[PDB]
Design a protein around this nucleic acid. Sequence first.
DNA 1: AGGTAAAACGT
DNA 2: AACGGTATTACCT
Length: 200
Amino acid sequence: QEPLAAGAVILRRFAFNAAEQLIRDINDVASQSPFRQMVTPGGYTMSVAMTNCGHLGWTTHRQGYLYSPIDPQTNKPWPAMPQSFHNLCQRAATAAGYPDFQPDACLINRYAPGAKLCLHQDKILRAPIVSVSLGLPAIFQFGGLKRNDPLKRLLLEHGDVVVWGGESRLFYHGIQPLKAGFHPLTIDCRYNLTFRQAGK
DNA sequence: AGGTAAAACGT
DNA sequence: AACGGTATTACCT
Ligand SMILES: O=C(O)CCC(=O)C(=O)O
Ligand SMILES: [Mn+2]
């Protein structure tokens, strides 16, 4: 449990023991709602490929960003949140000092070599974010409330969990372009799980 | 009024 | 290649 910011902590290798099962469940989720690279409102295809599980999934469309109960690619509900995901999330939230967190949304990100996520805030209720890294390492940027607030850069390795909330809830953060490499469990990619409470 | 796109090129 | 401009507006509710 390392002090990233007010309300924020990195729990290194927290999910290491759970990771094989987590990855099996990512595969099961994506067999129903496939990974897709979404298109921004501005018309650019994101380098990260995404899917979701739980009641609500994050998606883009022409008018903005949206949490939706329906996957617009399949026209069916997102797959149910795996119990492995929910149990890990709750354990990590508890360890980070957010014992009452009840997520209803899990965004699954797959990073191939070169994929990034430019600095952004998680907007759209005042609950924490629990963010689980799997596979290849990546450099995570964590800033402040303003885009030009100085950035901490942290290598996130397989099994690391970052939790933010309270004063750091809306802080800008991001992922630098993924370096190529090998990981025994994911082979050639990084996955992240982002748990939120997106609904009432 | 106030929130949201940019979760996306030049130096 | 780290930093910051752009939304310094347009278009919604
Ligand atoms: O991949 C990560 O560690 C961060 C992902 C993220 O910020 C998001 O999906 O909103
Ligand atoms: Mn985010």
